[PDB]
Amino acid sequence: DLGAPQNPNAKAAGSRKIHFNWLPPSGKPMGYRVKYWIQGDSESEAHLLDSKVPSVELTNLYPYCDYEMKVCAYGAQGEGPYSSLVSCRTHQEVPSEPGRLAFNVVSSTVTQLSWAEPAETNGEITAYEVCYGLVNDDNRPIGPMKKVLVDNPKNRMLLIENLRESQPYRYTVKARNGAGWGPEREAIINLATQP
Amino acid sequence: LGAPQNPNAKAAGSRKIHFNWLPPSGKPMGYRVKYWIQGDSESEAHLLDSKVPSVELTNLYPYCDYEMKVCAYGAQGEGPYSSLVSCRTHQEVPSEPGRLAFNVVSSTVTQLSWAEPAETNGEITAYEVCYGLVNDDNRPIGPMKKVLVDNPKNRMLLIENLRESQPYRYTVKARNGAGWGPEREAIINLATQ
Ligand SMILES: C[As](C)(=O)[O-]
Ligand SMILES: C[As](C)(=O)[O-]
């Protein structure tokens, strides 16, 4: 009957998706059935898609994730054999917010700021940026921000000194990966009113 | 420092929104954008910083309404926020329907049902049921019968004239504005269900 689709080819295309194409098999295929799954998963966790043309876009995938996939053809007699297996990884996406900020009071003018890695890295985190400045009683910034680039992603703690005694400050931490910077995690803190 | 004016959002690509505005009056050093899923507390808002009067909101939910606003910050701190703008993300194909449920009626008849996809990712307008004979290896061995369901609310179908004691593969998939999603499958033989 129908032969196996030939030259299966895949490539990341856009956000959370993969363009998977192949060469129609000898004979008269009426369509194609694609099976794909996260690399490492049992085919029991595979997803099934149909297509009338020799290509298909796999969507709603996880970012920076490895996928495996194969395709077979079907016609009047039934389904033919599956093509060989191809693998492909999805593009990165900016990380989510870092974990909630934690503060240790070293003195009336110094604090240690720490944070957990974002719940969703969506890639490989290469840095963090800490920003902070004075805010009024309504928590509104009233002066320029101070920014510190953290080059070592494992160093999720920063000592901040020379802070104005008994004044509230707004602190934020944002993370970067291959796709760029993500949203910021925020906290309003006054070292004088901390436990 | 004034408030950025003429803010406007536009769905741009998958799970994304292009939000832009006009630089305010004064000397803005950058901008803070606040956005959240419409209907949720601003307490659930996400915060982005940008040096240019434009930003790409990503990792959003498909077919979801979002509200947003932006402010500029400078030597004296933050200026007031812009007016609020709303925008809805594009649709994505639905996930697969719920696991297929069969209630055998006769040796040649069965009722088939399924739940709505966990992730509709849009407004489902139809489902397609497909079924046919399979061999020992669960490989389709013949023609595939197809029933189009135009009313998304009718997620139950009565199937008749099935060959006695023969295994069949059943699949159901959903369609919304973005197209057809993946299919939910099941191989069943009424003689041994
Ligand atoms: C370092 As300062 C601008 O709080 O004097
Ligand atoms: C309705 As038949 C093709 O199983 O005889």
Q: B29 touching A, CB under 8 A?
A: yes
Indicate the resolution in Å.
2.2
Domain A1-91, what fold?
Answer: Immunoglobulin-like (2.60.40)
According to the entry, how was the structure determined? X-ray
- For atom 5 of ligand 2, the residue with the nearest CA is B163
Determine whether the interchain pair A184/B48 forms a contact, defined as Cβ–Cβ distance below 8 Å: yes
Same fold, A1-91 and A92-195: yes
Contact status, residue B189 vs residue B140, Cβ threshold 8 Å: no
In chain A, how many H helices and how many E strands?
Answer: 0, 15
Helix extents (H) in chain A: none
Closest Cα in chain A, distance from residue B142 (Å): 5
Query: Does the CB of A53 have a partner CB in chain B at under 8 Å?
Result: no
Give yes or no for a contact between B110 and B103, defined as CB atoms under 8 angstroms apart. Answer: yes
Q: Which CATH class is domain A92-195?
A: mainly beta
Residue with tokens 């969507």: A59
User: What is the rounded distance in angstroms from the CA atom of residue A142 to the CA atom of residue B70?
Assistant: 17
Question: Could you tell me which CATH class the domain B1-90 is placed in?
Answer: mainly beta
- Domain coordinates of chain B in residue numbers? 1-90, 91-193
Which of these CATH numbers, 2.40.30.30, 3.30.1330.10, 2.60.40.10, 3.40.630.10, describes B91-193? 2.60.40.10
HEC string of chain B?
A: CCCCEEEEEEECCCCCEEEEEECCCCCCCEEEEEEEECCCCHHHCEEEEECCCEEEECCCCCCCEEEEEEEEEECCEECCCCCCEEEECCCCCCCCCCCCEEEECCCCCEEEECCCCCCCCCCCCEEEEEEEEECCCCCECCCCEEEEECCCCCCEEEECCCCCCCCEEEEEEEEECCEECCCEEEEECHHHC
